[PDB]
Amino acid sequence: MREIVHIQAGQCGNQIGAKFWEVISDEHGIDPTGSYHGDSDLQLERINVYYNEATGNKYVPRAILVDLEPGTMDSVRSGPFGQIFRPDNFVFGQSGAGNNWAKGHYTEGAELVDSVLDVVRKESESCDCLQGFQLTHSLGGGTGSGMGTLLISKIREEYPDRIMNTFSVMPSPKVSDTVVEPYNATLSVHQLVENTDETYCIDNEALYDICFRTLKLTTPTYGDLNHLVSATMSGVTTCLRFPGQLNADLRKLAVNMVPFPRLHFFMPGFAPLTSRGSQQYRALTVPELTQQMFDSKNMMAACDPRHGRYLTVAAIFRGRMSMKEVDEQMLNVQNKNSSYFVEWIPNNVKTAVCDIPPRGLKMSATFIGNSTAIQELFKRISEQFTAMFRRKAFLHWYTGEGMDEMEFTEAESNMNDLVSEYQQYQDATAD
Amino acid sequence: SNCVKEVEKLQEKREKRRLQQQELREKRAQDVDATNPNYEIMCMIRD
Amino acid sequence: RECISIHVGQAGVQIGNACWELYCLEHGIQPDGQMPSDKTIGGGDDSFNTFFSETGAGKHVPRAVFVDLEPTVIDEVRTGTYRQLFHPEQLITGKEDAANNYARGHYTIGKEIIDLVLDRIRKLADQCTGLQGFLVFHSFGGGTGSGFTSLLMERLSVDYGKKSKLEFSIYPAPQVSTAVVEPYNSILTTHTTLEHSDCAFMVDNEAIYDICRRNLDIERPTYTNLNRLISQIVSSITASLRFDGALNVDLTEFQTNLVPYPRIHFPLATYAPVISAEKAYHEQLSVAEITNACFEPANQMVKCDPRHGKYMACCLLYRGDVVPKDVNAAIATIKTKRSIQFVDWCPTGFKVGINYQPPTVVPGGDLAKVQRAVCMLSNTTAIAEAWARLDHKFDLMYAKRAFVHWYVGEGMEEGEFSEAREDMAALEKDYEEVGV
Ligand SMILES: Nc1nc2c(ncn2[C@@H]2O[C@H](COP(=O)(O)OP(=O)(O)OP(=O)(O)O)[C@@H](O)[C@H]2O)c(=O)[nH]1
Ligand SMILES: Nc1nc2c(ncn2[C@@H]2O[C@H](COP(=O)(O)OP(=O)(O)O)[C@@H](O)[C@H]2O)c(=O)[nH]1
Ligand SMILES: [Mg+2]
Ligand SMILES: [Mg+2]
C-alpha cells in the first residue's frame, strides 16, 4: 500500500483541486517549480502518496486534470502552482458541458474518457503498489458529475482490487448556477452508491451558511467556499499524509469507517472556522477544539448531528498538544452524548494526532463522521428532484441527449432507498 | 440473527427484483423486429 | 530436539525482534553471531542449540523465519542493529497487506505466498537432526496475524503431522487499538486455530498497559515500551528450553504440566518482580515476596480474577539467586493462607524449577537488572473472562452484521461466522464445566 492517483473533473472540481494541491504542497514544503525546501523530515516520510518522484530533485503531483471547458486549464497553468504539473497529465476537451450530466457521461465526455484512461494507466504503470484513486468534482455541474461518474465506473472496473475515493460537492439553492442541479446530483449519487468506497460530502449550501453566518462574509464568492473545502480536505488526508498507525492507508480507514456497503457518506468537520488571511488573537484550546468540531456550526454538510447518531468517527488533532488532554476530552464528548452514538460498535471513535499543524493555524481539529444524519442532505435532493420529476419538466435536455426515462426512476428510487436504509440503521438497539 | 437488518433485507431483495424488471425490457426490447425511430410507436400499435 | 520459531504480522515480528535480542543477551552471544565460550565453530549439541544452528564461521543463526504481507516491519528487522545476524531468506515480505482483514490473510493474499513460506520453513527444518516442533508469534487483531497464521497452522499440521506447535497471541486492548473489527479477526483466528494448537498463551495488551503505567511509570506507553515488557515476560517461560533446566524442557511437556484437556490450553501467566530501572531501588525482594506477587491481578497478563475462579495446573519457574527450601516454605504458606480453589481431578501440587543464572535484561532498557525472578504458569478457569470481553464486543456487531461485507468481499462465507460463534460458545461452556 503506497501511491494514491488523484483526479479532478469539472469547473468546481478543478478549482478546488488546485487549491488542495496548493495546501498540501505548502505543508509538505514544495515550491511552484517543484523543488523541496522544507525544514522537517516528517514532511517527507510519506511524500510519495501524492507525489511522483521526478529527476532533478523535483516533485510532480501524481494528479490528472480533466475538463471539457478550455478556459479552466488556462486558469490552472497561469495560476500560481500551474508550472509544476506534468503537462502530459493535462487532458481536456473543447465542447463544454452546459451543467448537463447526460452530456458529460454519454456524449462529449465519452469521446475523451479513453484518453483519460491512457494517462491514468501511464501513472499506474510507473507505480509500485497502487492504493486507490481520490476524486474531486461537482455534483451540480455537467463535466465533473457526468464525466466523473463515468471515470469512476471505468476505473473501478479496470482495477477492482484498489480503492475508489471521492470528494463530491452539493447543489445549493443559495448558490445555484442552474435549475437542473437536482437532476445532476440525483444521478451522480445513484452512481456513487454502488461505485465508490468513500465519499466525503461537501455541501455547497452548508458552506454558504458557514461563510455568511459564522464568518459573516455577506457576498460569498466561490474562492471563499473553496478555502473551507481546501482546509477540510487537508485535514481529512492527514492520516494518509503523515506517519500514523491509525488509518495508515485508504483500505484501513475505509474498513474502520464503513460498516455497511452502501452507507459510506461522511460528514466532515473543521475547527476553528477560519476566514482567509485572518489573525488568531487567541488560538483555541483542546476543550474548545473538541467542542466545536462536533458542533453543527462546523459541519461541511448542511445537517444536524443532534438529529442523527454517528456510526463511526475519525478525529484528527493537528499541532502539538497534550495527548492525555486529547484522550480525556474525546471521552467527554463521547459519553456525554452517548444517546447520540451507536453502542453496538465498540471503540468506534478512533483518533490520530499530527505534529505539523495546518498553515497558519497553531492547532486544528479535523473530524470525519459516518452519520445517519447525512440523510437530511439526500432528502433535500430527493424532494427538490421529485418536485420537478412529477410533470417530467426539463427532461428533454437529457432524453434529447439519448437517455432512458427509467434511468431516472432507478435513481430516485435508489436514493429514497438509501434514506430508508439510514433511518433503519438509526433505530438500532442492543437486544 | 438480528431484526433491523431484516427490514433492510426486505429492501435489498426488492431492489434486485426491480433491476430484473428493467433488465427484462432491454434484452426483450430487442428480439427480431425491434427497431426504427418509431419503435415506441410501433410497440404501441402492436400492443 | 531443536525448535523453530515463526513470526506473523507487525506485532509478531516486532515481538520476535525483542525476544531474540534478549536470548542473545542471556546466552552471551554477540550481535554478529559469535560467543566467547561456544564450542569450536559449530557443535550443535549445547543446551542453547535447541534454538541456534551454528555455522563454519561460528555464526549462531536463530532457527527462525520472519513473515509479513507488508515489508515495512521486516525491513526494520534487516535494518536494525542486528542486520548481520539472520539470512535474507529467513525474511519473507509480501506486497499488499491484509489491512486488518482476516479473509485477506487466510484466503486472498495468503494463498499467494504460503508456498514460499513453507519453502523457507523447509531449509531450516532439514538442518534439524531431530525436530521437536514449532513456536509461532502473531496478533489477534491484525490482518496478517489473524489470517495467515490460521492458514499456516492448517498447512502445518499437514506438512509436519503432529510433533508440537505452541502459540503466542496478543489480545486486543481498546487502548492502543487501531481497528474497529479487531474482535472479528480475533474470534476467527481462534475458531480456525483451536485444533492445530498444542498450547497457547495470551497477552492482554490492556494488562501490559496497566503494568507499564502502574509499576513502570510511563504515562503514555509507546509500542516499543509494551513490547520491551512482553519480551522479558516470554523469555522466562522459554528459558527452560534453552538452558539445561529442570521443568518445561520439551514442547509437549507444556501440554503435560499445563494441559489436562487439549481444548483448554490457555494458561494464565504471571511474572514478578516488575520494577523499573530507576524506581524504588530499596532492598531487593525475597523469594517469598515474588512468590506472593504471583497471585495479584495487578501482575497477571490477562485482566481476570483467578479468585472467583478455579485453578487446574500451576507451575512456577524461578531464575537468578534462589534457595529451594525457601520456595518450599512460600509454597506452603500460600497453600494454606489462600482460597486458591483447585478442581478435584488435577494434581494441586505445584511443580517448580530454577536456573542459577542472573536474569539479564536490556542494558539501558525500561526495566531493572533484577536479581531473582519467578513466573507462574497457572491455567485457570477465570481466564474465561477474556473471551467474554470479545464475544460481547462481537455479538453487538454480528447482531448488525456490520463490517461483515468486507470478509464476504475477500473470499469467505457468512456461515463461517455462524460456526465460529457457536465454537467459541462451546469452549466457554467447557471452561464452565471444569469447575462444578
Ligand atoms: N504488544 C504489541 N501489540 C501490538 C503492536 N502493534 C500492534 N499490536 C496489536 O496488534 C493488533 C494489530 O495487529 P498487527 O500485527 O499490528 O497487524 P498486522 O498483523 O501487521 O496486519 P496488517 O496491518 O494488515 O498487515 C492491534 O490490536 C494491536 O493492539 C506492538 O508493537 N506491540
Ligand atoms: N465550492 C465551489 N462550488 C462551485 C464552484 N463553481 C461551481 N460550484 C458549484 O458546482 C455546481 C456547478 O458545477 P460546475 O463545475 O461549475 O459545472 P461543470 O463545469 O460542468 O462541472 C453548482 O452547483 C455550483 O454551486 C466553486 O468555485 N466552488
Ligand atoms: Mg465547465
Ligand atoms: Mg501490518
C-alpha distances in angstroms, A256 versus A72, A250, A299, C402? 37, 10, 21, 11
> Is position C253 annotated as part of the catalytic site?
yes
**Which subunits count as partners of chain C given 3+ CB pairs below 8 Å?**
A, B
Do C391 and C432 fall into the same domain? yes
Q: Which of A105, A256, A413, A136 shows the shortest CA–CA distance to C143?
A: A256
Which cell is A263 given?
452507507
C-alpha distances in angstroms, A246 versus A194, A315, B5, C393? 26, 10, 29, 20
* A393 has a chain C CB within 8 A of its CB: no
Q: Contacts by C117-124 with C-beta closer than 8 Å and gap 24+?
A: C117/C65, C117/C67, C117/C92, C117/C152, C118/C155, C118/C159, C120/C65, C120/C89, C120/C90, C120/C92, C121/C4, C121/C6, C121/C65, C121/C159, C123/C89, C124/C4, C124/C53, C124/C63, C124/C64, C124/C65, C124/C90
Q: Which residues contact A172 (CB under 8 A, 6 or more apart)?
A: A140, A181, A203, A204, A205, A207, A208
Between CA C53 and CA C44 the distance in angstroms is 6
**Which chain B residues contact residue C401 at CB under 8 A?**
2, 5
| DSSP structural state of residue C287 | H
* A429 has a chain C CB within 8 A of its CB: no
User: Residue C156 sits in which domain range?
Assistant: 1-267
Between CA A201 and CA A181 the distance in angstroms is 15
Do C249 and C285 fall into the same domain? no
Taking a contact as any Cβ pair under 8 Å apart, which residues of chain B between 1 and 47 contact chain A? Answer: 2-4, 7-8, 11, 15, 18, 22, 25
Please name the residue of chain A whose CA is at the shortest distance from the CA of residue C402: A259
Helix (H, G, I), strand (E, B) or coil at C426: helix
What is the number of other CB atoms lying within 10 angstroms of the CB of residue A93?
A: 18
Residue type at A414 in one-letter notation: N
Distance from the A425 Cα atom to the nearest Cα atom in chain B, whole angstroms: 7
Q: Which of A12, A66, A14 shows the shortest CA–CA distance to A175?
A: A12
Task: Test B22 with A410 for CB contact under 8 angstroms.
Answer: yes
β-bridge mates for residue C270, sequence order: C300, C376
Count of residues in chain A: 431
Which ligand is in closest contact with the Cα of A96? 3
Between CA C6 and CA A351 the distance in angstroms is 32
**Which chain C residues contact residue A347 at CB under 8 A?**
174, 177, 180
Chain breaks after residues in chain C, where C lies over 2.5 Å from next N: none
Distance from the A353 Cα atom to the nearest Cα atom in chain B, whole angstroms: 35
Listed in sequence order, the DSSP H helices in C57-173 are 71-79, 102-103, 109-111, 114-126, 143-154
**Which subunits count as partners of chain A given 3+ CB pairs below 8 Å?**
B, C
What does residue C166 show for φ and ψ, rounded to 5 degrees? -125, 140
Listed in sequence order, the DSSP H helices in chain B are 5-28, 39-46
Q: Which of C75, C188, C168 shows the shortest CA–CA distance to C422?
A: C188
Helix (H, G, I), strand (E, B) or coil at C113: coil
Task: Test C405 with A261 for CB contact under 8 angstroms.
Answer: yes
Q: Which residues contact A22 (CB under 8 A, 6 or more apart)?
A: A80, A81, A230
Which residues does a 6 A CB cutoff place in the pocket of ligand 1?
Answer: C 9-11, 14, 69-70, 97-100, 139, 141-145, 170, 172-173, 176-178, 182, 205, 223, 226-227, 230
Domain A1-259 has CATH 3.40.50.970: no
Going C24 to C30 to C31 to C32, the CA torsion angle's sign is: negative
Which cell is A142 given?
455537467
Please name the residue of chain B whose CA is at the shortest distance from the CA of residue A425: B4
| 3-state secondary structure string across chain A | CCEEEEEEEHHHHHHHHHHHHHHHHHHHCECCCCCECCCCCHHHCCCCCCEEEECCCEEEECEEEEECCCHHHHHHHCCCCCCCCCHHHEEECCCCCCCCHHHHHCCCCCCCHHHHHHHHHHHHHCCCCEEEEEEEEECCCCHHHHHHHHHHHHHHHHCCCCEEEEEEECCCCCCCCCCCHHHHHHHHHHHHHHHCCEEEEECHHHHHHHHHHHCCCCCCCHHHHHHHHHHHHHHHCHHHHCCCCCCCCHHHHHHHHCCCCCCCEEEEEEECCCCCCCCCCCCCCHHHHHHHHCCHHHECCCCCHHHCCEEEEEEEEECCCCHHHHHHHHHHHHHHCHHHECCCCCCCEEEEEECCCCCCCCCEEEEEEEECCCHHHHHHHHHHHHHHHCCCCCCHHHHCCCCCHHHHHHHHHHHHHHHHHHHHHHCCCCC
Q: Separation of A397 CA from ligand 2 center, angstroms?
A: 19
- Order of strands across the sheet that contains C199-201: C91-93, C64-68, C2-8, C131-137, C165-168, C199-201
Q: Is C10 annotated as a binding residue?
A: yes
Q: Separation of A12 CA from ligand 2 center, angstroms?
A: 4
Give the relative orientation of helices C223-237 and C9-27 as an angle to the nearest 10 degrees.
Answer: 60
Please name the residue of chain C whose CA is at the shortest distance from the CA of residue B8: C400
Between CA A264 and CA A199 the distance in angstroms is 6
Spatial contact of A139 and A167, defined as CB atoms under 8 Å apart: no
A406, A410, A424: residue with CB nearest B4: A424
Resolution limit, Å: 3.5
Spatial contact of C338 and C332, defined as CB atoms under 8 Å apart: no
Q: Where are the domains of chain A?
A: 1-259, 260-373, 374-431
* B1 has a chain C CB within 8 A of its CB: yes
What does residue C238 show for φ and ψ, rounded to 5 degrees? -105, -5
β-bridge mates for residue A130, sequence order: A3
First to last CA, chain C: 39
Residues with a beta carbon under 5 angstroms from ion ligand 3: A 11, 69, 143
Q: Which of C230, C152, C254 shows the shortest CA–CA distance to C196?
A: C152
Spatial contact of A148 and A10, defined as CB atoms under 8 Å apart: yes
Query: Considering only CA atoms, which residue is closest to atom 28 of ligand 1?
Result: C177
Spatial contact of A203 and A172, defined as CB atoms under 8 Å apart: yes
Between CA A424 and CA A262 the distance in angstroms is 13
Between CA C273 and CA C285 the distance in angstroms is 8
Q: Which of A389, A336, A345 shows the shortest CA–CA distance to A369?
A: A345
Report chain C residues touching chain A, CB-CB < 8 A: 70, 95-97, 99-101, 174, 177-181, 183, 219-220, 393, 396-397, 399-400, 402-403, 405-406
Between CA A263 and CA C126 the distance in angstroms is 52
Q: Which of C106, C80, C75, C112 shows the shortest CA–CA distance to C93?
A: C75
Q: Which of C323, C330, C325, C320 shows the shortest CA–CA distance to C292?
A: C330
| DSSP structural state of residue C264 | B
Residue type at C362 in one-letter notation: V
β-bridge mates for residue A371, sequence order: A310
Between CA C143 and CA A341 the distance in angstroms is 27
Helix (H, G, I), strand (E, B) or coil at C52: strand
β-bridge mates for residue C315, sequence order: C351, C377
First to last CA, chain A: 39
Spatial contact of C380 and C346, defined as CB atoms under 8 Å apart: no
Residue type at C228 in one-letter notation: R
Spatial contact of C411 and C103, defined as CB atoms under 8 Å apart: yes
Count of residues in chain C: 436
What does residue C120 show for φ and ψ, rounded to 5 degrees? -90, -30
Say which of C154, C253, C385, C416 is annotated catalytic.
Answer: C253
Spatial contact of C368 and C275, defined as CB atoms under 8 Å apart: yes
Please report which helix (H) or strand (E) contains residue C427, including its range.
Answer: helix C415-433
What is the number of other CB atoms lying within 10 angstroms of the CB of residue C119?
A: 13
Do C75 and C50 fall into the same domain? yes
What does residue C261 show for φ and ψ, rounded to 5 degrees? -140, 135
Chain breaks after residues in chain A, where C lies over 2.5 Å from next N: none
What does residue C198 show for φ and ψ, rounded to 5 degrees? -85, -50
Between CA A420 and CA A417 the distance in angstroms is 5
Q: Where are the beta strands (DSSP E) in C32-75?
A: 52-53, 61-62, 64-68
CA A88, distance to chain mean position in Å, is 25
β-bridge mates for residue A65, sequence order: A8, A90
Do C252 and C359 fall into the same domain? no
Between CA B28 and CA C297 the distance in angstroms is 72
CA B22, distance to chain mean position in Å, is 2
Distance from the A412 Cα atom to the nearest Cα atom in chain B, whole angstroms: 12
Please report which helix (H) or strand (E) contains residue C328, including its range.
Answer: helix C324-337
Between CA C302 and CA C310 the distance in angstroms is 15
Kind of pairing between the strands at A364-371 and A310-318: antiparallel
Q: Separation of C8 CA from ligand 1 center, angstroms?
A: 10
Do C150 and C63 fall into the same domain? yes
Between CA A250 and CA A164 the distance in angstroms is 9
Name the method of structure determination: X-ray
Helix (H, G, I), strand (E, B) or coil at C277: coil
Domain end, chosen from C361, C382, C403, is at C382
Domain end, chosen from C231, C252, C267, is at C267
Do C261 and C275 fall into the same domain? no
Burial class (CB in 10 A: 0-12, 13-18, 19+), C346: middle
C-alpha distances in angstroms, A50 versus A59, A179, A385, C68, C186? 10, 36, 37, 25, 34
Please report which helix (H) or strand (E) contains residue C191, including its range.
Answer: helix C182-191
Q: Which of A315, A425, A409 shows the shortest CA–CA distance to A371?
A: A425
Between CA C97 and CA A255 the distance in angstroms is 13
Which cell is C266 given?
490457555
β-bridge mates for residue C14, sequence order: none
Q: Which of C5, C283, C219 shows the shortest CA–CA distance to C120?
A: C5
Between CA B21 and CA B23 the distance in angstroms is 6
Burial class (CB in 10 A: 0-12, 13-18, 19+), B20: exposed
Spatial contact of A231 and C78, defined as CB atoms under 8 Å apart: no
Spatial contact of A132 and A115, defined as CB atoms under 8 Å apart: no
Do C46 and C35 fall into the same domain? yes
Q: Which of C387, C378, C318 shows the shortest CA–CA distance to C348?
A: C378
Do C145 and C204 fall into the same domain? yes
Q: Tally the C-alpha atoms within 13 A of residue C319's C-alpha that lie toward its C-beta.
A: 26
Q: Which residues contact A9 (CB under 8 A, 6 or more apart)?
A: A66, A67, A135, A136, A137, A143, A144, A147, A148, A151
Q: Separation of C406 CA from ligand 4 center, angstroms?
A: 17
Between CA A331 and CA A306 the distance in angstroms is 18
First to last CA, chain B: 47
Q: Is C139 annotated as a binding residue?
A: yes
Q: Contacts by C83-89 with C-beta closer than 8 Å and gap 24+?
A: C84/C31, C84/C32, C84/C33, C85/C20, C85/C31, C85/C32, C85/C33, C85/C61, C86/C61, C86/C62, C87/C61, C89/C65, C89/C120, C89/C123
Which cell is A75 given?
486558469
Do C286 and C231 fall into the same domain? no
Please name the residue of chain A whose CA is at the shortest distance from the CA of residue B17: A410
Burial class (CB in 10 A: 0-12, 13-18, 19+), A415: buried
Distance from the A372 Cα atom to the nearest Cα atom in chain C, whole angstroms: 14
Do C219 and C284 fall into the same domain? no
The CATH homologous superfamily for domain A260-373 is Tubulin/FtsZ, C-terminal domain (3.30.1330.20)
Chain breaks after residues in chain B, where C lies over 2.5 Å from next N: none
Q: Which of C424, C422, C382 shows the shortest CA–CA distance to C140?
A: C424
CA dihedral C344, C349, C350, C354 (to 10 degrees): -160
Listed in sequence order, the DSSP H helices in C339-383 are none
Going A72 to A77 to A78 to A82, the CA torsion angle's sign is: positive
Burial class (CB in 10 A: 0-12, 13-18, 19+), A181: buried
Between CA C164 and CA C152 the distance in angstroms is 14
Taking a contact as any Cβ pair under 8 Å apart, which residues of chain A between 408 and 427 contact chain B? Answer: 410, 413-414, 417, 420-421, 424-425, 427
Between CA A345 and CA A348 the distance in angstroms is 6
Give the relative orientation of helices C182-191 and C384-398 as an angle to the nearest 10 degrees.
Answer: 120
Which cell is C228 given?
520491551
Between CA C200 and CA C166 the distance in angstroms is 6
Q: Which of C9, C2, C15 shows the shortest CA–CA distance to C224?
A: C15
Spatial contact of C189 and C145, defined as CB atoms under 8 Å apart: yes
Which cell is A270 given?
473543521
Do C117 and C210 fall into the same domain? yes
What is the number of other CB atoms lying within 10 angstroms of the CB of residue C75?
A: 13
What does residue C92 show for φ and ψ, rounded to 5 degrees? -110, 125
Spatial contact of C204 and C303, defined as CB atoms under 8 Å apart: yes
Between CA C111 and CA C151 the distance in angstroms is 8
Between CA A368 and CA A268 the distance in angstroms is 5
**Which subunits count as partners of chain B given 3+ CB pairs below 8 Å?**
A, C
Distance from the C393 Cα atom to the nearest Cα atom in chain A, whole angstroms: 6
Q: Tally the C-alpha atoms within 13 A of residue A233's C-alpha that lie toward its C-beta.
A: 30
C219, C397, C402: residue with CB nearest A324: C219
Number of domains comprising chain C: 3
Q: Which of A307, A223, A260, A284 shows the shortest CA–CA distance to A22?
A: A223
Q: Separation of C71 CA from ligand 4 center, angstroms?
A: 9
CATH of the domain at C287: 3.30.1330.20
Query: Considering only CA atoms, which residue is closest to atom 22 of ligand 2?
Result: A140
Do C325 and C295 fall into the same domain? yes
CATH of A374-431, one of 3.40.50.720, 1.10.8.590, 3.30.565.10, 1.10.287.600: 1.10.287.600
DSSP string spanning C194-244?
TTT-SEEE--BHHHHHHHHHHTS--SS--HHHHHHHHHHHHHHHSHHHHTT
Which ligand is in closest contact with the Cα of C172? 1
